[PDB]
């Protein structure tokens with residue numbers, strides 16, 4: 066019983082998760098924030114100091130942590146998609162947009178983006194096309210989807 | 220055991236945030252700081268929330284945070300100064316009470332005589348609650364972080 070936002074950098078996961086957490090009265094968890102608070106260091110500095118393997122392990126620990134808790138609204142990192150069984154974090158909302166759209170709101174990245182699109186679509190409980198929508202439109206659509214979930218029945 | 224988390228409890232000034240973060244790094248656990256989590260949710264200092272919503276809403280937010288701690292696992296948790304008043308706080312995990320006397324905490328910082336008696340009274344009362352709920356009681360007075368981490372690590376192992 067978590068709401069879990071997944072998608073690529075630039076998709077607005079942090080902004081949406083926070084607002085929704087406040088509206089639905091849930092615990093707001095931001096993956097990058099939690100990692101940075103633990104290490105007292107920016108995420109990129111963590112990656113550079115400890116190596117990609119350590120960094121990925123931290124991402125996995127965050128994913129496992131998300132799968133353990135309840136009543137949270139979670140913004141996941143750009144690495145979440147690659148962890149083991151990421152759909153177990155809760156009800157997943159994929160914030161979908163094309164590469165050019167995401168790029169403007171922020172190479173190897175394109176490679177990552179191309180190969181990861183299918184994983185997001187598979188893990189999503191709900192796919193939300195975010196292009197050209199303001200925050201209130203997005204929140205409205207998400208709140209409807211959550212109400213539909215909690216209507217069946219519960 | 221079946222304790223899911225390490226939970227630091229005690230008054231403000233007892234060093235819960237610093238020790239929980241340090242231990243989280245050393246034992247490779249998730250670091251959760253109650254006040255940080257509340258502030259990132261409302262984008263407001265935890266104090267300003269007391270003023271905008273009811274004191275009852277604030278206690279409700281503190282209770283929801285406690286529920287959350289009781290739900291998760293493999294975290295190292297710095298609880299707030301209100302945590303001791305929540306219900307079923309033992310469900311949060313292995314509780315470590317960071318103990319210090321009033322005089323000491325006053326150093327690690329109520330302009331009126333009356334306000335200080337009130338504060339001391341409050342302190343005295345919560346003292347028995349902390350020592351009640353603690354799985355390990357750690358006096359922090361005049362001890363540096365490496366000494367505190369060493370004592371905690373030993374206790375965890377046992």
Ligand SMILES: [Cl-]
Pocket residue numbers: 230231232233234235236237
């Ligand atoms: Cl503190």
